[PDB]
Subunit: 483 residues, 4 copies
């Protein structure tokens, strides 16, 4: 067996936009993402799937069922977010000089929170309180995340921006968003601190800036291709993180961290180890050096330094890189860039999404963070698109083993949260990518236990990979799978 | 949910030759099958795999572990056989006219059993008693089968016969075997009646005669190609069944049945329904009409009539047939005649063994037997070769559902026994075909729970296909599998 | 045997941007498409492959070898374009009210032509003359096409437009481009008419407008997503075609047609026949009714323009695969998993093999397309493109024979089809996809620029030299066996 | 370019039983193989496919058409056999001590030949003359082979032997067959020497003995499993070859060789080179050392037989794929998943594509086999068979060019190789597998008996007419791309 520390918790992560809608009464039309996936032109271009989130798994109405299943599964931790748009669906009075590059301080006090109070949707707040109380009643430790991608439409009209029009609400391109995000975060902590165990400001800010402004074929808002604007967005979201951290801490003593999108950077040949380090700097260290050490672009900002208590590690697969004349490049045919339901250039099985099986990468990522910063971590996402459940039992057990391995090496990792408890709306890809331990019938909103859920219940209830399921710490056999 | 009657039992079947050996001390070199798979010429011809049963899962030594796992899995029934060769490894004194075609009576009484007693291996008998006592102590209902293919070498030297030499011990071609089988069966019931709940005389006599003397590419002993001798073997094994039934009943009041190899015969087109009936007559009814009604080839034998209390239905897949000028033919590309790890001509997934997914066939077979004979049934075998466990969760739930369906239609089916609890020696194919709910590491003899075992535990402990696993009553998705 | 009329020609089609560059001194850096595929942001987004056209098959320098192989293969017809950008690399003097929606007339006279002649690149002109004279010396009948997608940069900066900046050169969004295209076409006809047998104004305007402004994941310039701007570009390209036809006719008596991208629209179920007609209207008839019958929609009204009516002598049918459509509450939709929307090197939802590009094998659609055009307009046709992405040459022998058979079938039904031009003689630069998609009868080694005959080229030679699908290769009129192929 | 010597010939090989029947009046029901494939028990066991040779490509009636296509394809050599059973359908008079292990001499003189002539079927003889004269009229050099597996039923009843009854005609288990084969070969030479350029005594004796008595799942007659009887049959077939060589030489001055089934033995790891040598000894050298050097094992002793020594003028190299071997405690073993032991239409354990028959693409092995024979014996060779089961023709263009290149390489290294004969010109009856395995350059429609040129036939014509792999097809000297193929 592989036994975990008595305090280690197994659980799951999910997001508001992806899971909440589906039950009549749950509809939240007020985000950039809602508008984006309903857009006629985006649909015709195939940038979005045509599936709509209001036809979703219905966590808003059915949360008690989700929680019942999580409890039966032996889970002891959950990470979810509140949707900003639900709490503040209408524009807030403008506060503050918008032309200033840096946002070093956002003053938040009791009076200001009471004023914000008057703009908040009370029905939304009460409902979230009901969801989280039910969550806590199952013995679930609660990590509350403030943001998992959708912005209020009054902060970002993504179609205007796609069209090249920067005169409207411009999302992460505007310091007004940084300012309001800080206040929103403080406001939520102020309202929910009694229920929350730990906080995250944000989920994967690198993906928001990266796919929003560079990887435009991904169909992420606002899909405006610009290196310069991707930089500006990332700069703003970093400041937003720091200002949200200060805002939360003005109102709570609880740990505040951040959740980030990771890949394990692997050398194509033994001559590519420098390329790996350059990739890690460019995709990981530059960001965390900003919010932990205050290092940014080359100065030190005291308002950025030390704004992090813990690191949420999301991990799915690797990225293979090679050294280049001018620098380095990532290679197609490995990691996230494989054919769906096939095999990578290394002969490793790929998921319904075309992502390569590579659990060793998780050990790489956890130990590298630990060695650099010595901040404790949760694995906040790890899972696989696999409606049939062919690969998931292996994917699950193998990655859990790599976590045990990281802890064995000295890394302080305090939980593993699978993505996800149930199938949900996979962004521009729609419902066809199914990540759940539980299968969703979208017609009836019924949840079914895929065999991996029975496997995870084994792990969670025992706090270990048991002797009986240890064989799943291996690669899915490729011979019976599609090539 | 699909709930079964309170008296219905879920369990498993296994065979002595396939599971017993593997632990030092368990070796049984005294069968036709042992000699057959060790034969240098058979190995060079590829008729046998080259794997040897003494390197097996080791039920002989490890039975307590098998039973522990079965109990944890919620199983309540088991069907196993004693190996004839273990109990009588040495030739018995010749009794009886060998030239007579019919064996209508075998006189067995107390004195004769006491005499046989003096030739029996006491160590083997005591060991089986230990295995079965442990089995009963887990709350397992016990179906004891007398025969599952290997014969004592002193009754059958299969290499001599393969070579065309009929002067030696000739197995089912000799009425001496019919005579000794009747006595052996009576002897075992006499020794074990206190432990046994129900009896089977034989496992799949049609396969012994069919592959032994016609389907010679299967590498089954003695591999002598002869329509005439296949008929003679089948004639003898039928009489053997009847004489074993009388012999058991001379010593016990408990139910005595037989286990038979079934296929669901399906019409290629709607013009082939006559072909189906001809196939069913030729492969099923002729045999059961002999041992139930005494009808044989065209007379009635009173010594054959009514020799059956129950029917063991083994079922894996269908056979597609078409009408022919001269009669009917079976079609390649369906049922058992598909490519391994692929798809049939109907687009249905095939197993590691090349067998087509067709659970509806089981409903067909159970209801047809019920309607003809009105004898109660157990599903004595059903399973799939699937080391990876990709298809098994679906195979398991789908077939269990078809049993529920048969019962719903009025058929008296009293249990479902999966083939098998753990991986074992798949005859001429060796160890590579893995049918277990539990995976065997043959190096250490350790057993692991494949996810289907967790699924089966759900079914068995609840006496139902539960709401949560009901989605597995479907065909494995073929898109992610090999074509 | 399937024998063709004695006058029928077998040949090939090729485009300037895709095949010219690759030999020393052949580079043409002056187009929208050149800038588009070199753009750092386009490359990082994966909109373009990273492959560059200047590393291509080298027709500019190696044309004699291309033509040697075409002659050896028994080909008797070719359709190529001149690249506008090579002839006019620098801007011409502003002539004309850019605010006017319609361009009903473009006056071109001999004096105007002689002025234009002062701005034309003479080396480029002379080189094209050398290429075309060699072509004609092989006994190849010559269809000269004026345009096959790239525009001079001075007429379109696609990066600016991608960024949503409409103050610069805007390509088909500007009537200036319409005006200049007319003059350009008249000019090329004026200079080359002695070498040309028939003219086409343009290749697949519907793709330029459709992928440029709607199908933006395709990585075609300017990649600005706008239904309204797609409509505007299509409106301009239609009037450009008409003005180019009048311009060519002012200087030549020869036939002037257009080449258009076709799909065979097929009903998912027997209840989807209406859906097909609606798709045919929306993707085909609306365009050809504008340039043949003068019928068109301007803003929100349905009018006849006398300046558009009758501007077409022949139709170039480009055809690769079908589109499967189904009827919807609000209209019709096309279905993934058939036609061009399949997995690469696999099988469609109908069990038909797909190409290296994920396009479904459906030769029957060529019969559908040819006979439908014939019955509507009764204008003669050439099949101006038909071919398959297939480096290994597994499917091409079947693809070629089967589609050629379908043209024999169309003629048999009464359709006036005068030739079949395979895409392409050799591998070339497949737009945003780069070099990996190989459509050639001849394989190109891009390192040495050497050409190799795939077995389909030997098959094609059998067809062309005999003017028939011979008895000996007739079995290739069938679907490539799927069992040995990837699924 | 890979150019061959001016004297080198490209051609094909074909067998009587596999190609002759299919036309009215061509049936030969009088062989062991005919009875074997019609046998009800063999059919029900799946030992044989159920396909029947009398439904075959019809060379007996259509030979002129076969030869027309071979001439069109530029072929200059052919190797065929006469079927023994057609010439002597009824038993001959018993001559000779059947209990003697060795047959050191078979006296044949002109008087004996004239007596044999009284029993020969004259219609069959005249028909073969007609076939062979037509063959020679195409400029085809003629290798006549005496035997390619089927024996007259009066010499072998394979069902009896399958049943373990050795009292009837026992085929290669009886010296009577050795004795009669010698007379038969002398006889055919006597009758046909004016038409023949070179002779082979037999095709692949090692397969006859090996699959007949050991590899019994292959469904080859008599399918009686016995190491000892396999040894006995191989011993007899060896002496039959020697006696047939002396018999032919008594009547002809022409070269007399033998055709043998080859595999290239390859080491799994660098520690398996000894294993290869042992496999080469056991599967190849032991046989050829008997008939060239007279070295052999009788019962349990190693002797030189003067009556076996030097009975060979040339070696026919048949080659399809490799065998991968590894060293074992007790010796060596060959490995599944490489060579002929792969899944059909898939990839081997080495990632190389497999044929319709599950045979791995390994042209390098032909170089290995040719040079090894050359270095051991210094006898000239023809590649007498090489080809692939491939109905679709996906892999054959690569298979053909690559193996032909390997023969060019062998000659380059000094090996005297005088021709390459593809198996086969057209599809035919593949033994126990039936018609489904298609090896032809030409595809056969078995309903009409029409022949079609697969693209590989056009490729082969390029090679044969030029006497070279030309520059234009040189890219086919490569492995078929696996990505678009089934795995
Ligand atoms: O793609 C799976 C999963 N992965 C994610 N990042 O990699 C997102 O956080 C989550 O919203 C998404 O659903
Ligand atoms: O082939 C699976 C299984 N199936 C069986 N019959 O179909 C045999 O009873 C059993 O011994 C064998 O292992
Ligand atoms: O996609 C192949 C081919 N097909 C075309 N239309 O479909 C284009 O005219 C041509 O430039 C392109 O290369
Ligand atoms: O298996 C193809 C071919 N190969 C052969 N040896 O390998 C035989 O001589 C020939 O008869 C057979 O048809």
């Amino acid at each position: 067996m592989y036994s975990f520390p008595n305090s280690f918790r197994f659980g799951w992560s999910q997001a508001g936009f992806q899971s909440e809608m589906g039950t009549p009464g749950s509809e939240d039309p007020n985000t950039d993402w809602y508008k984006w996936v309903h857009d006629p032109e985006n649909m015709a271009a195939g940038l979005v799937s045509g599936d709509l989130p209001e036809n979703g798994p219905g966590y808003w109405g059915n949360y008690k069922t989700f929680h019942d299943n999580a409890q039966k599964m032996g889970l002891k931790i959950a990470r979810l977010n509140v949707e900003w748009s639900r709490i503040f669906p209408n524009p807030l009075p403008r506060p503050f000089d918008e032309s200033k590059q840096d946002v070093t301080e956002v003053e938040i006090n009791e009076n200001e929170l009471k004023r914000l109070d008057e703009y908040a949707n009370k029905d939304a707040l009460n409902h979230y309180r009901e969801i989280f109380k039910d969550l806590k009643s199952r013995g679930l430790y609660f990590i509350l995340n403030m943001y998992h991608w959708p912005l209020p439409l009054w902060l970002h009209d993504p179609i205007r921006v796609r069209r090249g029009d920067f005169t409207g609400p411009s999302g992460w391109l505007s310091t007004r968003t940084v300012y309001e995000f800080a206040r929103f975060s403080a406001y939520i902590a102020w309202k929910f601190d009694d229920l929350v165990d730990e906080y995250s400001t944000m989920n994967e800010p690198n993906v928001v800036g990266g796919l929003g402004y560079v990887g435009v074929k991904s169909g992420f808002p606002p899909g405006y291709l610009s290196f310069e604007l991707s930089r500006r967005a990332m700069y703003n979201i970093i400041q937003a993180h720091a200002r949200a951290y200060d805002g939360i801490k003005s109102v709570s003593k609880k740990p505040v961290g951040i959740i980030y999108a990771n890949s394990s950077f692997q050398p194509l040949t033994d001559k590519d180890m420098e390329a790996v380090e350059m990739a890690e700097n460019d995709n990981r260290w530059w960001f965390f050096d900003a919010i932990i050490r205050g290092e940014i672009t080359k100065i030190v900002r005291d308002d950025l330094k030390g704004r992090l208590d813990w690191i949420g590690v999301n991990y799915y697969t690797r990225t293979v890189v090679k050294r280049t004349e001018k620098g380095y490049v990532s290679l197609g045919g490995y990691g996230h860039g494989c054919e769906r339901n096939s095999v990578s250039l290394a002969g490793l099985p790929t998921s319904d999404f075309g992502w390569e099986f590579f659990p060793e990468g998780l050990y790489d990522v956890l130990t590298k963070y630990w060695n650099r910063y010595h901040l404790y971590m949760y694995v906040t996402e790890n899972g696989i698109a696999d409606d049939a459940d062919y690969q998931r039992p292996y994917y699950l057990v193998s990655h859990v083993y790599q976590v045990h391995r990281a802890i064995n090496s000295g890394a302080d990792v305090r939980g593993y949260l699978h993505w996800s408890l149930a199938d949900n709306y996979e962004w521009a890809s729609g419902f066809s990518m199914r990540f759940g331990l539980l299968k969703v019938d979208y017609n009836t909103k019924r949840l079914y236990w895929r065999p991996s859920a029975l496997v995870y219940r084994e792990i969670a209830t025992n706090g270990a990979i048991t002797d009986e399921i240890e064989h799943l710490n291996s690669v899915p056999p490729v011979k019976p799978l599609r090539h």
